[PDB]
């Protein structure tokens, strides 16, 4: 209800808390390249260099 001489003013308050979930990091993974493709094999590693 809007008018040029009417204002609403609170007479009471409620204090409420809320969460805010935020990821900050991930799993530190590290896979090496030579072993993933070739695999413990010199003959295949020679075609990778």
């Amino acid at each position: 209800a809007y008018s040029n001489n009417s204002i609403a003013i609170p007479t009471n308050f409620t204090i409420s808390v809320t969460t805010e979930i935020l990821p900050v990091s991930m799993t530190k993974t590290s896979v090496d390249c030579t072993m993933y493709i070739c695999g413990d094999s010199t003959e295949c590693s020679n075609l990778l260099l």
């Binding site: 209800a1 008018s3 040029n4 001489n5 009417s6 204002i7 609403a8 003013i9 609170p10």
Partner: protein, 96 residues
Amino acid sequence: KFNGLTVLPPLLTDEMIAQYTSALLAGTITSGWTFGAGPALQIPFPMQMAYRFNGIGVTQNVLYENQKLIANQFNSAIGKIQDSLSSALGKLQDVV
């Protein structure tokens, strides 16, 4: 279209987005800034502009003593924005 690609519709259409924008505009026009921080409390727009002037350090008496000038300047700027804009939307067109 006919090689394996499709375009999905947006979740909410342009009518609903415009309705959201209209609701937000009505809220900030009538209630002020409080509709985003709890129940919306009405307040006359000249008094809301007096509070907004008080935010930037300019006392309330500045607005009321020359309220008509403020209204005329606001109307002029809003009316001139169409001429300034329709004669650009570069950041929206480049994405498309």
